[PDB]
């Protein structure tokens, strides 16, 4: 299971056409993870979930409820 990336050559994991959030960084936008088969996959970055606001020249979105969140720094 040999794969050739831009940051060297990785053996022991198989390439995947999908894309997920990174668990272990490798480089050049390539990461790896341990799915579930029970093998190690090497894939490409996933920046985040696609979104597109339904923007219109006379449309607004006003919240009707709130929530209090406590964050630790």
């Amino acid at each position: 299971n040999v794969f050739q990336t831009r940051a060297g050559c990785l053996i022991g994991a198989e390439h995947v056409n999908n894309s997920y959030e990174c668990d272990i960084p490798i480089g050049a936008g390539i990461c790896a993870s341990y799915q579930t088969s029970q093998s190690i996959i090497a894939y490409t970055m996933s920046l985040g979930a696609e979104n597109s606001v339904a923007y219109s020249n006379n449309s607004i979105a006003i919240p009707t409820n709130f929530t209090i969140s406590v964050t630790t720094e």
Binding site: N57, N58, S59, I60, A61, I62, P63, T64, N65, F66, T67, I68, S69, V70, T71, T72, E73
Partner: protein, 228 residues
Amino acid sequence: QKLIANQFNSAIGKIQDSLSSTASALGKLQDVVNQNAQALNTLVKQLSSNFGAISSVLNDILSRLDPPEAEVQIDRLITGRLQSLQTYVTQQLIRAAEIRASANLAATKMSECVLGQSKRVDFCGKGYHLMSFPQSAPHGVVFLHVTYVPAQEKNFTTAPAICHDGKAHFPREGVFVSNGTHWFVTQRNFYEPQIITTDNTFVSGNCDVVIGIVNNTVYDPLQPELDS
């Protein structure tokens, strides 16, 4: 009030549980201790090295060799150990500078986000900031930022202005929204519609200049009282 109190108490319980269960959240504090201990141990272990001399212990050299070249060997040992000490001191200096850089930011955060309410976005936590609480920790401080986040949205049609008698009326503070048939003026962060009236709007010139202005009636609180 009761709902907000319950949300706050639940959040406090949740952060307490998260801290109690997961032990990997304090990396920013354990890293300093690990680095310092590793540097100290490396410096200590650097003692037992020949650096080109016969033996790593000077006692053997002085008790086994004549002074004329035992002095050369001892000199080599001093040079090596002195260089090691210089390197350790330099690394300590740089690390202390970094810790000072962190401490200044910590002091600023304590001054602003705790002793007052800050309007800097994404400085005292995600969302709109409400307050903060400090807690001590080994060689560090832990902040609890209480913030505010909107939850549930809607959809509305809007308008920059409104004609009522050829004039243009703008909201004092808030936006004009329509639920399909009527019109209302409401604040920009919590849906609470109110009837448009002269106490919520102000006038500015005729209404053939604003773009996208739709006209509706504006109530006046004086006429019904003056009628009777």
